[model samples]
Target: TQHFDLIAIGGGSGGLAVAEKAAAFGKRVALIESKALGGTCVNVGCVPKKVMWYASHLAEAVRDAPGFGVQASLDWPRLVAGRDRYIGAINSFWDGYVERLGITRVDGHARFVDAHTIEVEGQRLSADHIVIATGGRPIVPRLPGAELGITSDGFFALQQQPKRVAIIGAGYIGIELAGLLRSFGSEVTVVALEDRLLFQFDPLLSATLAENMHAQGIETHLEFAVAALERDAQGTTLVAQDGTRLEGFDSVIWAVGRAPNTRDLGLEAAGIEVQSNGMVPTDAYQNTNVPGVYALGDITGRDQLTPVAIAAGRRLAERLFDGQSERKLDYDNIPTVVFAHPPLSKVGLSEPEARERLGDVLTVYETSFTPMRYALNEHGPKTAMKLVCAGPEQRVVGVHVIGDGADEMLQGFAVAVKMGATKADFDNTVAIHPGSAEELVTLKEPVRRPG
Candidate 1:
């Protein structure tokens, strides 16, 4: 029987991190992947999506270039082909790295034959430790004619962009697709059940983004649920539960949510417990109920971000193979960015969340200004920043930004917030001359206090 010191059942970010780190620690490791390496992030999610975002951003730049004395146009097919080539290079590198590290690469779906054993490609592989990092997939509503609509996966597969699109969801995925497609000259209408977009984010950010989306000429139908989808001579039509019909859409996309890729893994055969939502349950250490068996990333129902997955997998490898017994991921205060028009980014606690936890001690400092990039244009989008602080020392609990450079500006501020930087620390730091990010440190007086 072939055996390994550690085996990873998925070749996504988490699985690769575990396998590579284990191998580096001189442990015999093996990895199994039924699909392409780099998983969803490299194949469909971050990589391709970011490429599309860049294309849209460039288009926006061209639109703004008349004031700057530059002119440009987009060639969609060429852009897609180039993006595909870059992604293919990344996928090839991952395959080569596995072999270079002397780790066994099994190419087949892995099914748990037992707690310590997995069957792939008619071969039974055993390992002292097994890690599951299968990741997640986009969820489509199961309504009448739902099959006609595509998920985010299908969005990446489109050879030609849709001229008119109806996106059903208010989450980041829908918001992002809506913005990018609109920027690329597609007529887009966003439908969501929530009263506002990005409901989970701070209310101010969500409201501001929705307002800006409307001002940018994207149609939004909030608090409305999709009843069904239908196709006629005009094109695809989205029917709402209120009997309102929206027609002439070239494509319908469902970006409501995602489900963990834990189905048909034969977990029960290995005595591994799965949640009602199909997520594998794991403890603080990423260990499953069964000894020597573990899970991370979207499968564990923690933070579904790619970086979160990679961190958890590396921490697990350190504890198991590098003699670092105290290693584990700290799930708090992780920063994230939404690639909407004028992108939004946030880190740490939101004002509402901080108020709920810290009571009346919360103080919020806010600033709004026109970014210099829009100085030449009269209708330029406004940049907004807010800082949530608590306690007598006024420790910074959260930072939220939505504007021209929100995506790039959040990282350094996130580091300070993660390290428990106080309002005093921010005030003491000299502000950079005339920048959107400088607004973060320049805001002085409290604009509001939590009741």
Candidate 2:
């Protein structure tokens, strides 16, 4: 039997952050990981997705190199090889960091043997506190012949460039992957359940991107549902809910959504409660209904982002070791980004959600313009920006964008929002000259709403 002050289940972003901080504070810590060290974001989600997004961006540049007075073809295989190599190399570095932090990194799945005890690889371990940071899994909704399709997980292992493909789902993963497959010279068709792309964004932005994707030679089918995926005699045939059929795609990629990866972790035996979706409910300090037990990240199903989990884990450790610091996290104003081409970064409420809460809201600003790179060419997308305010004096309620550098730009604006920035405050800040980001600070009249 082994004992420690703390044990973290799922050695991903959240658990690792907690383990490292706790160990630094002179507390013994153990972390059990069923698979990779870095969890979903690093192993299969954000890290790999961003690398692919960057590769897709470069692919577009090479395709348009003639206009730049250069004629060069991209050695895509080299890029792919380099991307894989980089991921592998960094995996080692992260592993070493965890070890150096004085954390016992157990290499196996963890199961609760009791409320305060866990078993990993046949070894019995007990700790005063347990943190479950088990991540999430891609949800492939049940459909006839759904086995013929793959999730975002399969994108990493694609054998080669596919000539034509059908992607299901119009969310972030669907649109982004379709754009990337198109850049790689694949005739891509995106079949969506919704009317346009990024239904979470403004309808205007969705329409613009749908139009832009079409202009770029990608086909879009809206209000279409994937009924059955059949593969055989004539290659893969996708029959939609509306009875339309498509054939001869190398593969189908399903990007519908992801659900928490919590099952058979012995939650019932341990007095822990799981929501219907298998997400562990927790409070500001990351504590579950089971005392001394906590969960974070996608498992908590709170924010489902890497940074949010990291923040919560750090706070949990601080409360355990530090004396004079706050142990709570403010979930509001958490920044998020989706790495679709042109990308999108957002913080705070959506415009509609804001108006729904604050009735007769006033002072909303918006901008839609083709980026400088697209100025010379009409083929690229015109990015969209929006800001929502309750009134002239109230703090800005939302910031949204679909364009280049949106992910990077949103971070700075998130800071301002955290500090209670308002429309007048935005007007007071001097705008950066000749930049897309400056639009956030230089808005004129409210794209007025009816009171």
- Report the number of the highest-lDDT candidate: 1
lDDT of 2 by residue, 1-451 (tens): 3569899998888998889889989998998898888888777777777887788888777766666566877355776687778777767887999889888888888888888999887888999889999888888878898988888888877657667788888888788888878877788999888877888766655776776688778888888888899886645888987788887778788888888878879898798989988989887778899887988888887887889989888888999766635677789988888776667778887777777877776577888887776554436677888888876485798888878777688888899999988988888999987778888888888787647
Clashes of each: 0, 0
Model 1 C-alpha lDDT per residue in residues 1-451, reported as the tens digit of each score: 4569998989998999999999999999989999999999999998898888988888888788877676654567887899999999999999999999999999989999998999997789999999999999999878999998999999988888899999999888999999999998999999999998999888879888987898889999999898989887768888999899997888899999999888988799999999989999998899999999999988898878899999999999999998898899988789999999889999988898888888889889988788999877757778788899998899999999998989898888878988999999998999998888888888878988755
Which regions of candidate 1 are displaced past 4 Å? 71-73
The TM-scores of all predictions, comma-separated, are: 0.98, 0.95
Displacement of residue 345 (Cα, Å) in model 1 is 0.7
Root-mean-square deviation of candidate 2: 1.9
Clashes (candidate 1): 0
**lDDT score for residue 160 of model 1:** 89
